[PDB]
């Protein structure tokens with residue numbers, strides 16, 4: 001497995017017309033999945049990370065936008081990175097996207113981190129594009145190799161004991177961080193429960209406590225749920241992704257929560273910006289933004 005050759009080929013298309021594919025070999029991709037899965041299982045399911053770092057939300061196969069985020073933020077390992085999930089589905093280049101991210105995880109495993117999004121799940125990505133992309137460009141056996149790797153991704157991260165990060169949001173079942181630590185891998189994303197909620201829930205300005213989520217999965221939570229959680233666990237901020245936001249980032253509950261979404265012009269259906277959050281050594285947050293086209 002020649003990681004530098006793989007990364008070189010992935011990066012060669014920088015400056016090309018957004019759309020030019022990078023087609024690694026099936027054995028290369030299988031290697032990326034197997035080695036990264038070993039690393040994910042060797043690190044905790046609840047990551048404990050240090051600032052400074054850059055945090056990115058959803059990518060959804062917008063590979064050329066991933067390359068712009070690295071061009072703006074610094075290619076690994078010039079900056080440390082945490083991604084919050086949803087690497088695949090909807091976009092045109094999920095394969096290049098996930099392969100570059102797994103190659104950087106293997107190259108820089110203590111400086112580059114990937115969380116699980118709700119789309120890193122076989123039954124979801126069966127429907128929303130990644131299965132079809134693997135069947136077209138590779139084969140379904142390689143799709144299953146990716147699933148096996150996805151099933152071992154970590155679920156949440158805490159930066160310097162102060163910023164709690166996950167793809168979706170909070171859970172009415174989350175009373176102790178130990179409940180996250182206890183989750184065994186590999187696992188699928190269940191249709192309900194703590195792991196489902198961490199990958200699927202959303203904040204809501206108009207709900208008091210916990211509400212029913214319009215997605216038909218998981219819950220919504222309001223501002224006082226956020227405040228109570230931060231106080232209980234001695235945290236300063238929840239950082240999550242999952243929802244498209246026009247500015248690429250959006251604060252909630254008097255800046256106690258932020259939503260990041262990193263795929264601009266999302267799947268051609270939205271006129272949103274994509275943002276990456278820069279967290280400095282003192283945990284102050286600023287943004288680098290891919291403005292809409």
Ligand SMILES: [Cl-]
Nearest residue numbers: 003004106107
């Ligand atoms: Cl190396």
Ligand SMILES: [Cl-]
Nearest residue numbers: 209222224225
């Ligand atoms: Cl509330």
Ligand SMILES: [Mn+2]
Nearest residue numbers: 058060086242
């Ligand atoms: Mn998403």
Ligand SMILES: [Mn+2]
Nearest residue numbers: 086117118242
């Ligand atoms: Mn999502």
